Design a protein around this ligand. Structure first.
Ligand SMILES: [Mg+2]
Ligand SMILES: [Mg+2]
Ligand SMILES: [Mg+2]
Ligand SMILES: [Mg+2]
Lengths: 441, 441
């Protein structure tokens, strides 16, 4: 190991992009988001210029609450040797997520968990950079006992023990060189959400579809759930542009009650969607299973997970057979540590993982987790695909590289969390240039 | 209606009590809590001197994060006519809990929901005071159609429609005068948690038991789950002091994994506990059902709910038959509005409600909800009891009145949320007298 240094400084800033003024990103539930992030930077006393950068994604308002919670957690990482953190990553994870007082404001959900993901993302970035490897490669090269030492198994040993996790990782060693070669040569298959958004005229939507088809996209998501006639109008346009052999996914962003989701989907089934994403509340495990049993006979699978708050919810979704596609999120769960536990549970249950992405930097982070999944955990692309959105990559130092609608594996050390300091400063809320122009004093 | 005024001001303060230095309040999970609250005060332009006071309870660190989230929600209540809020309480509830951007930092869980409960508590206090009635009486006297108009049924219409809620409330009209007379004459039955805490010597625990027995207590809770031998030592002392005919409840505060909870409880079953509270994660619905099926044959019921984040979790706990006793919390759920939806679901499923209380002012608030439950919803005391803890009532203007281990119904207008301004100022964190002495600058 090349790990060194004591964590000496932490900064956290409220960064907001005015995407609600751009006209893209509206869904049936979040009709006016301003893609934002709590951006964390940690420094060591190593004098090597290597910094750990971390993010968590928000929709604008509430980013200041996340920043507050990052400040509440900061004393746990400050003045700690990085060797001591990475040497007992499970222990450090438990101190952040089960703090005897702070856990009351979660536990492991909402603001406090988003803040925990931002801090832990900065530590994974720092560790991967000191090791001179992208996070996906750090994970791929990790000894299975070392990897399981980073994971907290509390509340999931009833479906996945440490021993079960080791067995999946040992099996994942077989053909790992061939799978890493495959990833470097062709990338991780993606779908586009760039034609999905609510509010587009017919002409606008036809233009976005034509451009995506021309650019090589063959898998498409569409937002639904506010207005059935509008959903039929937009699904008709997309399905006519893309043809019957191309993949169409629908996303209701939690709009419906359980019987309502079945009824609405019975009317949209003519568009032959591969899946219906978030048909109801992200907490309703039994609800997702009820909708899944009703719709799998129509040939429609259920997808959920982007707002699923922790591994206990994912465990029950797998236990209840509530979903056909499990959608991890790099910044909703407890960073790499908790995402690893969910990848391992999904393989244990033989359920495909289709990551959520988009927002501010979710593509940049989550691509590492799913490349690692392919090489070392599931060893398959069957029924698996990574979301992609064409937003805000110009603000990242290491933006995602898409080739033939595929994620090319990041080459640089780190978790691709690092933002351009000029971008951070212009978009800092409330005093950055952009917000002084949009909300003048 | 006597409702008037435009909400003109809102204040929120971080109030913390140093209960970790007192030696009481430790459990197996939260070993050093400082009972605290985000204290909200709203004023109107009515010039009647009536203010709405609200709280949400925390364990100390993280109260400043809740205060931040109250500030994020404040613009929704400021400059609003109280008539417009109480006239469409469902609509106002949806704007606070499904704000198109703020809901991303929950939704309806963690910090953002605790903050929502604090704001909504201040509005219920204000409304009940302008009507010159304690909240329990405001609810009892409310027309059933008016009461259901205060409740958001999203994600629960599959188990409880508006029509189903109306049917339960219409039935609850029968014998309501007789039940209100019963409440005023004898109060709501309570149990004490004052002998429950971890860290007590044998002598100390025997002294607390003897004093509680002398004071008339006959129902006792005990904390368990950190150390089996310590649990056997303390359960033996309590069971020997109180005898076999008195009620003993155990509370593991989420310590265990599912198989571990069954094994640990098989060893404590000799103490004949009525229930085991929070045996595992407050999110694990399927887990609570697994433990319930294993333990109900030993004569031990499962209780949970104090950290259950919203009505969707309670709905699934009822659907899965995961619990024998449902524990509502006045400040974890979305204030009176969401607690009403959970009381109505528990009656629909014929499951007894045993409120959680203690902390800072939870006794003062939750007593209104359970008195209302008895008079207008469940119409029974069978298998039902309210928690009581002897902490911090001297800091409330309207402290709970206990007579013969029973909650005597509050007589004064409001939700009993109002704190003594001298108490708030001395305990304000970080600049109140107490915190300047404990954490000098
Ligand atoms: Mg989605
Ligand atoms: Mg894969
Ligand atoms: Mg409890
Ligand atoms: Mg009752």
């Amino acid at each position: 190991s090349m790990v060194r240094g004591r964590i000496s400084r932490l900064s956290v800033r409220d960064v907001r992009f005015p995407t609600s003024l751009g006209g893209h990103g509206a869904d049936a539930m979040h009709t006016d988001p301003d893609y934002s992030a709590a951006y964390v930077v940690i420094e060591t006393d190593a004098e090597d210029g290597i910094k750990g950068c971390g993010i968590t994604f928000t929709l604008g308002k509430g980013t200041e609450v996340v920043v507050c919670a990052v400040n509440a957690l900061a004393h746990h990482v400050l003045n700690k040797d990085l060797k001591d953190i990475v040497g007992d990553f499970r222990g450090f994870y438990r101190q952040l997520t089960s703090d005897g007082q702070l856990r009351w404001i979660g536990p492991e959900k909402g603001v406090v968990h988003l803040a925990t993901a931002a801090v832990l993302n900065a530590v994974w970035d720092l560790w991967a950079k000191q090791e001179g490897k992208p996070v996906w490669k750090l994970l791929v090269d990790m000894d299975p006992r070392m990897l399981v030492s980073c994971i907290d198994f509390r509340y999931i040993t009833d479906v996945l023990t440490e021993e079960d996790a080791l067995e999946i990782l040992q099996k994942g060693q077989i053909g790992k060189k061939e799978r890493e070669k495959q990833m470097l040569a062709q990338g991780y298959p993606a779908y586009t959400t760039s034609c999905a958004w609510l509010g587009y005229s017919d002409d606008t939507l036809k233009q976005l579809c034509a451009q995506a088809l021309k650019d090589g996209w063959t898998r498409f998501k569409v937002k639904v759930g506010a207005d059935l006639q509008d959903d039929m109008r937009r699904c008709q346009i997309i399905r006519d542009m893309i043809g019957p052999e191309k993949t169409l996914m629908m996303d209701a962003n939690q709009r419906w009650d359980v019987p309502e989701a079945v009824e609405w989907m019975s009317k949209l089934a003519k568009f032959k969607p591969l899946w219906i994403e978030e048909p109801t509340s992200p907490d309703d495990i039994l609800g997702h299973a009820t909708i899944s049993k009703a719709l799998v006979p129509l040939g429609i699978g259920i997808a959920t997970g982007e707002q699923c708050h922790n591994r206990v919810i994912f465990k029950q979704l797998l236990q209840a057979k509530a979903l056909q596609f499990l959608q991890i999120d790099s910044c909703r769960l407890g960073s790499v540590n908790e995402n690893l536990s969910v990848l391992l549970m999904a393989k244990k249950f033989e359920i495909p993982v289709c990551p959520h992405a988009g927002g501010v930097g979710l593509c940049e982070l989550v691509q590492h987790l799913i490349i690692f999944d392919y090489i070392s955990v599931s060893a398959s692309l069957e029924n698996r695909v990574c979301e992609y959105v064409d937003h805000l990559h110009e603000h990242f130092k290491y933006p995602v590289m898409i080739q033939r609608a595929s994620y090319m594996p990041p080459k640089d050390p780190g978790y691709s969390t690092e933002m351009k300091e000029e971008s951070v400063k212009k978009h800092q809320y409330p005093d950055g240039e952009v917000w002084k122009k949009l909300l003048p004093a």
